[PDB]
Design an enzyme around this catalytic site. Structure first.
Site, PDB file in Angstrom:
ATOM      1  N   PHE A 293       0.833  -1.187   0.000  1.00  0.00           N
ATOM      2  CA  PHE A 293       0.000   0.000   0.000  1.00  0.00           C
ATOM      3  C   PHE A 293       0.869   1.239   0.000  1.00  0.00           C
ATOM      4  O   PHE A 293       0.672   2.149  -0.815  1.00  0.00           O
ATOM      5  CB  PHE A 293      -0.977   0.031   1.174  1.00  0.00           C
ATOM      6  N   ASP A 294       1.858   1.282   0.887  1.00  0.00           N
ATOM      7  CA  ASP A 294       2.783   2.413   0.965  1.00  0.00           C
ATOM      8  C   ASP A 294       4.159   1.863   0.604  1.00  0.00           C
ATOM      9  O   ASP A 294       4.978   1.565   1.465  1.00  0.00           O
ATOM     10  CB  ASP A 294       2.734   3.003   2.342  1.00  0.00           C
TER      11      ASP A 294
ATOM     12  N   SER B 224       7.359  -3.174  -0.841  1.00  0.00           N
ATOM     13  CA  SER B 224       8.773  -3.509  -0.874  1.00  0.00           C
ATOM     14  C   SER B 224       9.623  -2.420  -1.474  1.00  0.00           C
ATOM     15  O   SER B 224       9.214  -1.740  -2.411  1.00  0.00           O
ATOM     16  CB  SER B 224       8.995  -4.783  -1.695  1.00  0.00           C
TER      17      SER B 224
ATOM     18  N   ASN C 288      -2.503  -8.215  -8.995  1.00  0.00           N
ATOM     19  CA  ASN C 288      -1.502  -7.216  -9.295  1.00  0.00           C
ATOM     20  C   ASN C 288      -0.227  -7.860  -9.814  1.00  0.00           C
ATOM     21  O   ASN C 288       0.168  -8.962  -9.410  1.00  0.00           O
ATOM     22  CB  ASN C 288      -1.205  -6.329  -8.095  1.00  0.00           C
ATOM     23  N   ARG C 289       0.428  -7.121 -10.703  1.00  0.00           N
ATOM     24  CA  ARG C 289       1.727  -7.478 -11.234  1.00  0.00           C
ATOM     25  C   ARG C 289       2.585  -6.219 -11.315  1.00  0.00           C
ATOM     26  O   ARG C 289       3.222  -5.928 -12.328  1.00  0.00           O
ATOM     27  CB  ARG C 289       1.647  -8.172 -12.588  1.00  0.00           C
TER      28      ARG C 289
ATOM     29  N   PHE D  37       7.531  -4.661  -8.274  1.00  0.00           N
ATOM     30  CA  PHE D  37       8.464  -3.939  -7.408  1.00  0.00           C
ATOM     31  C   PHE D  37       8.802  -2.560  -7.980  1.00  0.00           C
ATOM     32  O   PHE D  37       9.974  -2.178  -8.084  1.00  0.00           O
ATOM     33  CB  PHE D  37       9.769  -4.715  -7.188  1.00  0.00           C
TER      34      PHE D  37
ATOM     35  N   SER E  76       7.237 -12.406  -3.740  1.00  0.00           N
ATOM     36  CA  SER E  76       6.482 -11.741  -4.784  1.00  0.00           C
ATOM     37  C   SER E  76       6.334 -12.689  -5.964  1.00  0.00           C
ATOM     38  O   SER E  76       7.318 -13.294  -6.387  1.00  0.00           O
ATOM     39  CB  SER E  76       7.189 -10.499  -5.291  1.00  0.00           C
TER      40      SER E  76
ATOM     41  N   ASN F   1       5.901 -11.623  -8.904  1.00  0.00           N
ATOM     42  CA  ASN F   1       6.049 -10.731 -10.044  1.00  0.00           C
ATOM     43  C   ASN F   1       7.486 -10.353 -10.331  1.00  0.00           C
ATOM     44  O   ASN F   1       7.726  -9.414 -11.092  1.00  0.00           O
ATOM     45  CB  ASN F   1       5.199  -9.485  -9.825  1.00  0.00           C
ATOM     46  N   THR F   2       8.442 -11.054  -9.738  1.00  0.00           N
ATOM     47  CA  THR F   2       9.848 -10.874 -10.072  1.00  0.00           C
ATOM     48  C   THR F   2      10.413 -12.246 -10.389  1.00  0.00           C
ATOM     49  O   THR F   2      10.358 -13.146  -9.548  1.00  0.00           O
ATOM     50  CB  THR F   2      10.583 -10.193  -8.922  1.00  0.00           C
TER      51      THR F   2
ATOM     52  N   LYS G 269       8.876 -13.227   4.520  1.00  0.00           N
ATOM     53  CA  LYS G 269       7.518 -13.265   3.990  1.00  0.00           C
ATOM     54  C   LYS G 269       7.423 -14.321   2.905  1.00  0.00           C
ATOM     55  O   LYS G 269       8.186 -14.291   1.925  1.00  0.00           O
ATOM     56  CB  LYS G 269       7.095 -11.917   3.427  1.00  0.00           C
TER      57      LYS G 269
ATOM     58  N   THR H 297       0.508 -14.616   4.403  1.00  0.00           N
ATOM     59  CA  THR H 297       1.264 -14.835   3.192  1.00  0.00           C
ATOM     60  C   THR H 297       1.220 -13.650   2.244  1.00  0.00           C
ATOM     61  O   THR H 297       0.444 -12.719   2.409  1.00  0.00           O
ATOM     62  CB  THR H 297       0.654 -16.000   2.351  1.00  0.00           C
ATOM     63  N   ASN H 298       2.061 -13.750   1.223  1.00  0.00           N
ATOM     64  CA  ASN H 298       1.973 -12.897   0.050  1.00  0.00           C
ATOM     65  C   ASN H 298       0.761 -13.332  -0.781  1.00  0.00           C
ATOM     66  O   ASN H 298      -0.027 -14.206  -0.400  1.00  0.00           O
ATOM     67  CB  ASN H 298       3.275 -13.008  -0.734  1.00  0.00           C
ATOM     68  N   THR H 299       0.619 -12.717  -1.947  1.00  0.00           N
ATOM     69  CA  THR H 299      -0.449 -13.070  -2.868  1.00  0.00           C
ATOM     70  C   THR H 299      -0.208 -14.445  -3.491  1.00  0.00           C
ATOM     71  O   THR H 299       0.900 -14.999  -3.459  1.00  0.00           O
ATOM     72  CB  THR H 299      -0.540 -12.015  -3.955  1.00  0.00           C
TER      73      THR H 299
ATOM     74  N   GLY I 279      -7.044 -10.687  -1.450  1.00  0.00           N
ATOM     75  CA  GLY I 279      -8.423 -10.557  -1.043  1.00  0.00           C
ATOM     76  C   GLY I 279      -9.065 -11.874  -0.667  1.00  0.00           C
ATOM     77  O   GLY I 279      -8.418 -12.853  -0.290  1.00  0.00           O
TER      78      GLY I 279
ATOM     79  N   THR J  78      -6.121  -5.485   0.695  1.00  0.00           N
ATOM     80  CA  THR J  78      -7.166  -5.477  -0.316  1.00  0.00           C
ATOM     81  C   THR J  78      -8.503  -5.036   0.263  1.00  0.00           C
ATOM     82  O   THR J  78      -9.268  -4.341  -0.404  1.00  0.00           O
ATOM     83  CB  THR J  78      -7.246  -6.853  -0.974  1.00  0.00           C
TER      84      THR J  78
HETATM   85  C1  LIG Z   1      -1.408  -4.021  -5.154  1.00  0.00           C
HETATM   86  C2  LIG Z   1      -0.611  -4.844  -4.215  1.00  0.00           C
HETATM   87  C3  LIG Z   1       0.730  -4.615  -4.093  1.00  0.00           C
HETATM   88  C4  LIG Z   1       1.482  -5.381  -3.220  1.00  0.00           C
HETATM   89  C5  LIG Z   1       0.859  -6.382  -2.458  1.00  0.00           C
HETATM   90  C6  LIG Z   1      -0.478  -6.606  -2.609  1.00  0.00           C
HETATM   91  C7  LIG Z   1      -1.210  -5.835  -3.475  1.00  0.00           C
HETATM   92  C8  LIG Z   1      -2.664  -6.124  -3.592  1.00  0.00           C
HETATM   93  N1  LIG Z   1       1.612  -7.182  -1.561  1.00  0.00           N
HETATM   94  C9  LIG Z   1       0.969  -8.281  -0.810  1.00  0.00           C
HETATM   95  C10 LIG Z   1       0.263  -7.830   0.435  1.00  0.00           C
HETATM   96  O1  LIG Z   1       1.227  -7.344   1.323  1.00  0.00           O
HETATM   97  C11 LIG Z   1      -0.454  -9.049   1.060  1.00  0.00           C
HETATM   98  O2  LIG Z   1       0.578  -9.961   1.397  1.00  0.00           O
HETATM   99  C12 LIG Z   1      -1.526  -9.665   0.138  1.00  0.00           C
HETATM  100  O3  LIG Z   1      -2.075  -8.727  -0.713  1.00  0.00           O
HETATM  101  C13 LIG Z   1      -2.609 -10.363   1.003  1.00  0.00           C
HETATM  102  O4  LIG Z   1      -3.215  -9.453   1.845  1.00  0.00           O
HETATM  103  P1  LIG Z   1      -4.710  -8.842   1.396  1.00  0.00           P
HETATM  104  O5  LIG Z   1      -5.498 -10.029   0.907  1.00  0.00           O
HETATM  105  O6  LIG Z   1      -4.407  -7.813   0.309  1.00  0.00           O
HETATM  106  O7  LIG Z   1      -5.214  -8.246   2.686  1.00  0.00           O
HETATM  107  C14 LIG Z   1       2.937  -6.908  -1.429  1.00  0.00           C
HETATM  108  N2  LIG Z   1       3.673  -7.658  -0.557  1.00  0.00           N
HETATM  109  C15 LIG Z   1       4.999  -7.433  -0.373  1.00  0.00           C
HETATM  110  O8  LIG Z   1       5.630  -8.116   0.414  1.00  0.00           O
HETATM  111  N3  LIG Z   1       5.583  -6.379  -1.104  1.00  0.00           N
HETATM  112  C16 LIG Z   1       4.934  -5.593  -2.003  1.00  0.00           C
HETATM  113  O9  LIG Z   1       5.565  -4.679  -2.558  1.00  0.00           O
HETATM  114  C17 LIG Z   1       3.540  -5.893  -2.166  1.00  0.00           C
HETATM  115  N4  LIG Z   1       2.822  -5.147  -3.075  1.00  0.00           N
HETATM  116  O1  LIG Z   2       5.385  -5.350  -6.553  1.00  0.00           O
HETATM  117  C1  LIG Z   2       4.632  -6.306  -6.775  1.00  0.00           C
HETATM  118  O2  LIG Z   2       4.211  -6.748  -7.862  1.00  0.00           O
HETATM  119  C2  LIG Z   2       4.273  -7.210  -5.645  1.00  0.00           C
HETATM  120  C3  LIG Z   2       5.176  -7.592  -4.746  1.00  0.00           C
HETATM  121  C4  LIG Z   2       4.845  -8.568  -3.752  1.00  0.00           C
HETATM  122  O3  LIG Z   2       5.574  -9.021  -2.863  1.00  0.00           O
HETATM  123  N1  LIG Z   2       3.530  -9.077  -3.829  1.00  0.00           N
HETATM  124  C5  LIG Z   2       2.604  -8.705  -4.765  1.00  0.00           C
HETATM  125  O4  LIG Z   2       1.458  -9.196  -4.783  1.00  0.00           O
HETATM  126  N2  LIG Z   2       2.997  -7.764  -5.683  1.00  0.00           N
END
Ligand SMILES: Cc1cc2c(cc1C)N(C[C@H](O)[C@H](O)[C@H](O)COP(=O)(O)O)c1[nH]c(=O)[nH]c(=O)c1N2
Ligand SMILES: O=C(O)c1cc(=O)[nH]c(=O)[nH]1
Ligand SMILES: [Cl-]
Ligand SMILES: [Cl-]
Ligand SMILES: [Cl-]
Length: 359
Positions: free
Chosen positions: A61-62, A83, A108-109, A112, A178, A180-181, A218, A246-248, A269, A320
């Site tokens: 988010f930030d 990140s 999301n993709r 980073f 992630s 996406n890397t 993570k 977890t991550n996504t 979500g 989300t």
């Molecule tokens: C648009 C967007 C962007 C990111 C993320 C998510 C989303 C939706 N998440 C993952 C996030 O921290 C979390 O692990 C998952 O999204 C699951 O939580 P929610 O289901 O969104 O509450 C994420 N995680 C992380 O470790 N580094 C990142 O830079 C990001 N960037």
């Molecule tokens: O920057 C992103 O694409 C990203 C990073 C991450 O750790 N998780 C995610 O869902 N997106």
């Protein structure tokens, strides 16, 4: 918000533009100070810190540390930024984030997109003592570290992040999950993870005491049983301070309805929720409940939070849900969680951590 505001801002703007505006609004403090005053029942002591409440804002988010104070104002008990990658990088081409409203999900993709360590360092330094006071008052700050797309030594990328932002963080996150890397998730494998985390922890241990953060890893929701066993073993072998779970997900659970369900990227979500909860549950068991877990994935209610806590999370995060329900969801989760703790006979969050494993 849930019915009157977010639908307009969501339908009006593509999701990335909406997110950028949300970050700007939040950074500027253009949200009512959250009315919910946190109950003592919600306080958690873990990772060397007091957390006034266990509901944090998840990484992403930030990404660049621009809205930390506004996020505390929204009622989060802790803020994770990132990140952050060592050098600035733009991430993937747009569009790179997609709403699945029928699923209460996002894909999301971003890849980073990051202002980089130096910019974030200076941004956090501008409020470093303000943060020290916030942390002492139970509002800690986490910094989530990534690696650049073109890096030829992932471990050195994370080491650089430890050195540059470690001194400004209550905890650091080695984000090896992630989707996406390219190649990043392979760093979750046993041998690569041990080498990577050994170097990270050496760098962390080399920081002066008051600047020495906890280190968490993570992980993905898509790990094999073997992967999870290996991570648990390495975490215990090395004394890693905690896990973020977890991550996504790169999976697409049966039943997704959104038109955009087959976009590439990580799914967040509601469709991730129980996959994440079950990953928490397994990691808690494999670490004998001795490794703090921050539970994240699909939390939008007190019940969602408490399910993760009872599965083994000491703290939870969300992202989300905020995109769908807006800032009111934070107080909602906290109020619902307090009510459920009382209903289920827990004296506070702490008593509920891992409770399902004692049944
Ligand atoms: C648009 C967007 C962007 C990111 C993320 C998510 C989303 C939706 N998440 C993952 C996030 O921290 C979390 O692990 C998952 O999204 C699951 O939580 P929610 O289901 O969104 O509450 C994420 N995680 C992380 O470790 N580094 C990142 O830079 C990001 N960037
Ligand atoms: O920057 C992103 O694409 C990203 C990073 C991450 O750790 N998780 C995610 O869902 N997106
Ligand atoms: Cl410093
Ligand atoms: Cl010294
Ligand atoms: Cl419940």
């Amino acid at each position: 918000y849930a019915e009157h505001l977010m639908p307009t801002l969501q339908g009006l703007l593509d999701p990335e533009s909406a997110h950028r505006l949300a970050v700007r609004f939040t950074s500027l403090g253009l949200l009512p100070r959250a009315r919910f005053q946190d109950s003592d029942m919600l306080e958690v002591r873990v990772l060397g810190h007091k957390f006034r409440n266990p509901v944090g804002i998840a990484a992403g988010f930030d990404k660049h540390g621009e809205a930390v104070d506004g996020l505390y104002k929204m009622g989060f008990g802790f803020v994770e930024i990132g990140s952050v990658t060592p050098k600035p990088q733009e991430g993937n081409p747009r569009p790179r984030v997609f709403r699945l409203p029928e699923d209460q999900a996002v894909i999301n993709r971003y890849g980073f997109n990051s202002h980089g360590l130096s910019v974030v360092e200076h941004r956090l330094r501008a409020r470093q003592q303000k943060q020290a006071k916030l942390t002492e008052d139970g509002l800690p700050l986490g910094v989530n570290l990534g690696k650049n797309k073109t890096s030829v030594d992932a471990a050195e990328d994370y080491a650089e992040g430890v050195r540059v932002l470690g001194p400004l963080a209550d905890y650091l996150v080695v984000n090896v999950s992630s989707p996406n890397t390219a190649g990043l998730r392979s760093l979750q494998g046993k041998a690569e993870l041990r080498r990577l985390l050994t170097k990270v922890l050496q760098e962390r241990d080399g920081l002066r005491r008051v600047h020495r953060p906890a280190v968490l890893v993570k992980i993905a929701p898509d790990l094999t049983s073997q992967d999870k066993e290996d991570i648990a073993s390495v975490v215990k072998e090395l004394g890693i301070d905690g896990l973020i779970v977890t991550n996504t997900t790169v999976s697409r659970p049966a039943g997704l309805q959104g038109a955009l369900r087959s976009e590439t990227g990580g799914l967040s979500g509601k469709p991730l929720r129980d996959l994440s909860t079950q990953t928490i549950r397994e990691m808690y068991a494999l670490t004998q409940g001795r490794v703090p877990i921050i539970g994240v994935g699909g939390v939008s209610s007190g019940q969602d939070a408490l399910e993760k806590i009872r599965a083994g999370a000491s703290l939870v995060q969300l992202y989300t849900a905020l995109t769908f329900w807006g800032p009111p969801v934070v107080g909602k989760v906290k109020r619902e969680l307090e009510a459920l703790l009382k209903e289920q006979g827990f004296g506070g969050v702490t008593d509920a951590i891992g409770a399902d494993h004692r049944r």
